Design a binder for this molecule. Structure first.
Ligand SMILES: [Mg+2]
Ligand SMILES: [Mg+2]
Lengths: 143, 55, 145, 104, 75, 72, 171, 121, 189
RNA sequence: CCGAUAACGAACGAGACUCUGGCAUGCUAACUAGUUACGCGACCCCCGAGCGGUCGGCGUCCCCCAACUUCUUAGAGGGACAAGUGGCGUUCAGCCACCCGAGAUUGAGCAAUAACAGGUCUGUGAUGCCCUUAGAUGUCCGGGGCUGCACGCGCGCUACACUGACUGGCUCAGCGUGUGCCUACCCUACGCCGGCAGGCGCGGGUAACCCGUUGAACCCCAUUCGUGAUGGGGAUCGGGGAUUGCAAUUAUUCCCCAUGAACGAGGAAUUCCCAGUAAGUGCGGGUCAUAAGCUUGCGUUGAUUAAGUCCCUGCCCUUUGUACACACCGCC
């Protein structure tokens, strides 16, 4: 009964993934994680302290879903709704430096490799890590 | 005046940099698909180009 | 946590030259000071190493004076350059965050400087009209009639 | 050879393209070159909406216009070399053709 | 109807008031706790999850915008 | 599509696939006496809703609403 | 490829060329019974066919004028030399061409003939040519300064739907 | 003082190290090449200033270009800035450096409202 | 067998009056697992009559500009309100809703055009479908103004709205408006 | 339309027409679209499955080196006609309900005579007449203005909040564009720098080939806020940082940090709207060197109410009254 990340609910999955990332802390965390907003359209920084680990976990899951996602792709996922105040709203994208630092940290832990063309994907042992954590969170969620 | 000021004003862009390809109008231009034609001239010639009504 | 209100839970504080309510959360209580906002409060509390889930009345004096030290002197506590209000002053060109009625008199001296040099923005400020080029034809009727 | 060419046909109407695509492939079958099937690409509907009035007075009546560009792709592929056999066009006015090879 | 001036932290007067009869009736929501105990409502949520931890409140819904509790079954 | 239209597409597709599978690979007795429950429970489980959209006109904000008019 | 513009732009340019050529031929061949223009295009070259009643008159002495217009269209749009030919062809039943009939009526009016009898003669010739019906409208400063409009119509004439497109010529 | 430096240092403050002291718009403007008319006008004001009588304010110079950023070496000149109708003379203060010439020759006189007319009945 | 929202079997819910039993659709033929079915019930007259009244509430509960497409939130509000009312009362929530609709229907109204005495000239008895329509609309309106500028969230307001209407205590907007309309119709007889 | 009939024979309009949308596992074709099967793999289960699960990872139009078009595309066609039943009907024209059916009323375009002193000579090398024509009402160039503000009105937008806001996670579209005759101005993947606005090298696309599997918004799931003018609201206003341009001031646009004003649902009045409709919600195209609170379309969520009426506002026919005929804004 092998468990893929698709057989577990992705929200507590990425929650436990970020928790494992926190306890096994080897990330190249930039010093400005305490200052920057996660996007241009945001007006508050993320409430979580080690939100960087959570975002890195989410990016790893997205690379599992579909590879070759460069910085612009990931900001398109992490884009959001810019309220623009009195003028009618639109849509904005995520922070390019934030996603780029997340990526450079992800191949900091070499769980991500750049592709032959543009963008980067997950290495097989990173796939192994994701699947192992999916199985363990499946065991926890079940029992 | 001499050439130094007769046409020295730049028009590499902006509305004055475009005229109708039929009547040289500077209003109601349509630049879609490189039409470069006056709106009224478009409505006049739309049969001739081939834009026809189906709805 | 979820215990009784502390004995030293002052309801409002006295910060610099203004008071702030301790009943709300700390992340938003100090924003009542003119020149302080949500983002600035967030960063100074994060760099203050003080819990954000607790009210401003239940803090202790060392914590609040740490906040005072950070607010008055943010450059030396790793605040980046672009986060300050009075950046590159017209008087002395020094990067400073201004925290109190100093901001009020700094705006005052900027406006009187603009009037003294007879700038168009200063002229519109003296006349009370819009300075950013907004249309006055239909709007701004409330302040006059 | 060995030649593998691509021929594409487009116009603004449907009848001319269909009749060219039919008679051309019939001639191809009479000339025993195996034919890759007619590939009908999605139609480009160039849509232009414009106010009916030329002055702006009235009921703000907008007239929209359409131009439908249909195109078809037919590959001619033979073990023998192609262009020396087939050179004739028999092309009516109004329809567009492009002669490309597998190199192109 | 002018204001509510609700308490943000418990005192001695309301802490035991929360403790002794709140897990005795049917419906327990932050709304009813705040409206019948004159507390803020964030304090209501905090107290409710503390009493969840204390094991004499049963949860039924646990939704992000509407959480419902009840007393334990008696009898 | 969206999310709930996605849900309805999936449920219709599964229902239609099962009735086709039971029509082909086994007798149509089972096919009919599952299609009955499908029909007199939910006709839309086997019949797609033909309504898609409706075009906006050049005198209103949507397909049928008109822009607000004034006289004075 | 990069040198060639997209198919959308190319078809737009084709329509533009059709419109410009029609306008130019109308403005020049107005007195010579111009009816319409048809162009046949190939990658090797293009063929231009000008439908006109007076082929003998639109052509100059020994084809001088057709050569003139061929050189004009060669230079104006910048084709390669010898990549365009212009043929003059007589239309069939010029009574049915509303373009040619409108040009004839315009000539008869500019010559000084009365509008009433000229319109009657044009309509009579059109119906003698054989058609389901015809309609002419004259608007302008008839009689005095104040504007008036005449419509002289006979036979069958629809107004609505698709079939009016390919059943009634409009000029 | 403009940025903590005195104007005496500003006279020998060359353009490239000055662009750090100006604002972003002014820095971009000087980063772009200044054209011939601006240079000629600077030559004009420098000529007038050197030939100006000692301890006396210079003679007036007129111009239409009012997009010129005020340079610290032109402080004290008599510039006639076009308003659309006339040329307006105004002092160049030691505070006006980051300011444009059009920012002091107003193009309109402020409106004094009288009794409304037939409109808004 | 149906167990709408996973529980609360419909078969024990019984309509007390024969007046609206042709227009309450909680029966097992109209009982559904989840109140969402874009069945085009407004395409034809009297097709909403066969629509389950829970779905009718769900349609009628999402209003007021900010809520014209937020039907999922409406369904979740319905589910939480059903949970709340069953915890508060202990019986079948659907029974509570049916009783609230029955007690919320205003049995007659008044309408006319000419010179009215107090509100309208003539008194008119109403149809059961209009009874159901007015009941649901009054309930949604009462809950909406019950939850606008108070801490008590919309689920609780809808819950006690249904609770008070299922019995009748002069405490809910729906039955108060019903009594006002009936008194006026009594006056305009 | 049936009928009667001093009318008969017609005609236009409507209808008929074309597109649009809905069913076609019916046909044709699909390496610029896919489906299935297989083989490489990689990872989980390996306790043990192994024809276990995932793959938008790699291949099988690389030419012999798998099949098919269900999904996608676009053509020829079919398919719905009041066709059947029941009821009403002079038993005719027709109408209601129902069965089967994708569909038993899909929205548009076109749209008659006649007319308005309705708008355009500021679209035209459309044009009559009049005015000007060298100190020009021609034309060019420079600047200003068209934004200007005691005030009134219109079209919209934001909003007034817990059916909410912020923070994080999860997750689904379709129109349609994209490098130029003049004409300089394209859509963009990836990699790096920066916090953002931006900058720096490499590519792809003249396009079902690249952006792009258009990872949109709304919505959904957890978090904090707690009924306050509060974390709603971001107008005003200061500083600073980026982009376009010859030039950004009366701020072009964008970013950041400060300030949070009125607004607690709106009088007398009045607007639009009946099913994928209103409304919420984002996205395209136009304008564009820079750009959308506008507009045209597209897409997502998806309702209450009604199957009637002339009460008001009007409209069509017939009769009747007139002193109206510039036609009741009449005339007197
Ligand atoms: Mg018709
Ligand atoms: Mg805030």
């Amino acid at each position: 009964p092998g468990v893929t990340v698709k057989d577990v609910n992705q929200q507590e999955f990425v929650r436990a993934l970020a928790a494992f990332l926190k306890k096994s802390g080897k990330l190249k965390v930039p010093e400005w994680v305490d200052t920057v907003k996660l996007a241009k359209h945001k007006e508050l920084a993320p409430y979580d302290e080690n939100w960087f680990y959570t975002r890195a976990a989410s990016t790893a899951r997205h690379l599992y879903l579909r590879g070759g996602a460069g910085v612009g792709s990931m900001t398109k996922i992490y884009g959001g709704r810019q309220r623009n105040g009195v003028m009618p709203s639109h849509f904005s994208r995520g922070s390019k430096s934030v996603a780029r630092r997340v990526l450079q940290a992800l191949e900091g832990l070499k769980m991500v490799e750049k592709d032959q063309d543009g963008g980067r994907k997950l290495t097989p042992q990173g796939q192994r890590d994701l699947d192992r954590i999916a199985g363990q969170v499946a065991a926890a969620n079940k029992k | 005046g001499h050439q130094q000021l007769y046409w020295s004003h730049p028009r590499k862009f902006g509305q004055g940099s475009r005229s109708c390809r039929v009547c040289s109008n500077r209003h109601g231009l349509i630049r879609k698909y490189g039409l470069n034609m006056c709106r009224q001239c478009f409505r006049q010639y739309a049969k001739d180009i081939g834009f026809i009504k189906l709805d | 946590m979820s215990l009784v209100i502390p004995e030293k839970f002052q309801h409002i504080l006295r910060v610099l030259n203004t008071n702030i309510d301790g009943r709300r959360k700390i992340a938003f209580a100090i924003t009542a000071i003119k020149g302080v906002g949500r983002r600035y409060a967030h960063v100074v509390l994060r760099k203050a190493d003080i819990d954000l889930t607790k009210r401003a009345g239940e803090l202790t004096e060392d914590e609040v004076e740490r906040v005072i030290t950070i607010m008055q002197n943010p450059r030396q506590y790793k605040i980046p350059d672009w986060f300050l209000n009075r950046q590159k002053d017209v008087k002395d060109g020094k990067y400073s965050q201004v925290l109190a009625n100093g901001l009020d008199n700094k705006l005052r001296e900027d406006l009187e400087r603009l009037k003294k040099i007879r700038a168009h923005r200063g002229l519109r400020h003296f006349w009370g009209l819009r300075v950013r080029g907004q249309h006055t034809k239909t709007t701004g009727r409330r302040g006059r009639t | 050879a060995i030649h593998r060419i691509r021929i594409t046909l487009t116009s603004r109407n449907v009848k001319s393209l269909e009749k060219v695509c039919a008679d051309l492939i019939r001639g191809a079958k009479e000339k025993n070159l195996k034919v890759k099937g007619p590939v009908r690409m999605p139609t480009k509907t160039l849509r232009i909406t414009t106010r009916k009035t030329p002055c702006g007075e009235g009921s703000k009546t907008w007239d929209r216009f359409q131009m439908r560009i249909h195109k078809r792709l037919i590959d001619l592929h033979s073990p023998s070399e192609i262009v020396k056999q087939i050179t004739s066009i028999s092309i009516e006015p109004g329809v567009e053709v492009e002669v490309t090879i597998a190199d192109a | 109807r002018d204001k509510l001036n609700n308490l943000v932290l418990f005192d001695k007067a309301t802490y035991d008031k929360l403790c002794k009869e709140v897990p005795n009736y049917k419906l327990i929501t932050p709304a009813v706790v705040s409206e019948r105990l004159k507390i803020r409502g964030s304090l209501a949520r905090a107290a409710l999850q503390e009493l969840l931890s204390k094991g004499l409140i049963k949860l039924v819904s646990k939704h992000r915008a509407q959480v419902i509790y009840t007393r334990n079954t008696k009898g | 599509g969206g999310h709930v239209a996605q849900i309805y597409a999936i449920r219709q597709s599964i229902s239609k696939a099962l009735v086709a599978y039971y029509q082909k690979y086994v007798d149509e007795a089972s096919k009919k006496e599952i299609k009955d429950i499908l029909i007199q429970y939910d006709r839309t489980l086997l019949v797609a809703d033909p309504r898609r959209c409706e075009s906006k006109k050049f005198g209103g904000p949507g397909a049928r609403a008109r822009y607000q008019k004034s006289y004075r | 490829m990069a040198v060639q513009i997209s198919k959308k732009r190319k078809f737009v340019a084709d329509g533009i060329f059709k419109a410009e050529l029609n306008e130019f031929l109308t403005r020049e061949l107005a007195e010579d019974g111009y009816s319409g223009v048809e162009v046949r295009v190939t990658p090797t070259r293009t063929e231009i066919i000008i439908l006109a009643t007076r082929t003998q008159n639109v052509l100059g002495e020994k084809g001088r004028r057709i050569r003139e217009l061929t050189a004009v269209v060669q230079k104006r749009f910048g084709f390669p030399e010898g990549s365009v030919e212009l043929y003059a062809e007589k239309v069939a039943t010029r009574g049915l061409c509303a373009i040619a009939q409108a040009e004839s009526l315009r000539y008869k009016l500019l010559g000084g003939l009365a509008v009433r009898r000229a319109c009657y003669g044009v309509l009579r010739f059109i119906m003698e040519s054989g058609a389901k019906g015809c309609e002419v409208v004259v608007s302008g400063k008839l009689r005095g300064q104040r504007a008036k409009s005449m419509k002289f119509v006979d036979g069958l004439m629809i107004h609505s739907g698709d079939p009016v497109n390919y059943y009634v010529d409009t000029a | 003082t403009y940025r903590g430096v005195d104007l005496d240092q500003l006279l020998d403050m060359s353009y490239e190290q000055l662009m750090q002291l100006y604002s972003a718009r002014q820095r971009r403007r000087l980063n772009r090449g200044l054209r011939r008319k601006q240079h000629s006008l600077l030559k004009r004001l420098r000529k007038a200033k050197k030939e100006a009588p000692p301890m006396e304010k210079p003679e007036v110079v007129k111009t239409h270009l009012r997009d010129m950023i005020i340079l610290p070496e032109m402080v004290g000149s008599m510039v006639g800035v076009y308003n659309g109708k006339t040329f307006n003379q105004v002092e160049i203060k030691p505070e006006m450096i980051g300011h444009y010439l059009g920012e002091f020759s107003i193009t309109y006189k402020p409106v004094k409202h009288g009794r409304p007319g037939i409109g808004a009945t | 067998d149906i167990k709408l929202f996973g529980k609360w079997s419909t078969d024990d819910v019984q309509i007390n009056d024969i007046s609206l039993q042709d227009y309450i659709a909680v029966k097992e033929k109209y009982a559904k697992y989840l109140p969402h079915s874009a069945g085009r019930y407004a395409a034809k007259r009297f097709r909403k009559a066969q629509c389950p009244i829970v779905e009718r509430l769900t349609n009628s509960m999402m209003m007021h500009g900010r809520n014209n497409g937020k039907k999922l939130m409406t369904v979740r509000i319905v589910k939480h309100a059903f949970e709340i009312i069953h915890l508060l009362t202990g019986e079948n929530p659907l029974q509570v809703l049916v009783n609230a609709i029955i007690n919320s229907g205003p049995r007659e109204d008044s309408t006319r055009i000419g010179r009215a005495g107090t509100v309208r000239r003539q008194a008119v008895d109403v149809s059961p479908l209009r009874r159901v329509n007015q009941a649901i609309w009054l309930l949604c309106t009462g809950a909406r103004e019950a939850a606008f500028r108070n801490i008590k969230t919309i689920a609780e307001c809808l819950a006690d709205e249904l609770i008070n209407a299922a019995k009748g205590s002069s405490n809910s907007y729906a039955i108060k408006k019903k009594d006002e309309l009936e008194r006026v119709a009594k006056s305009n007889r």
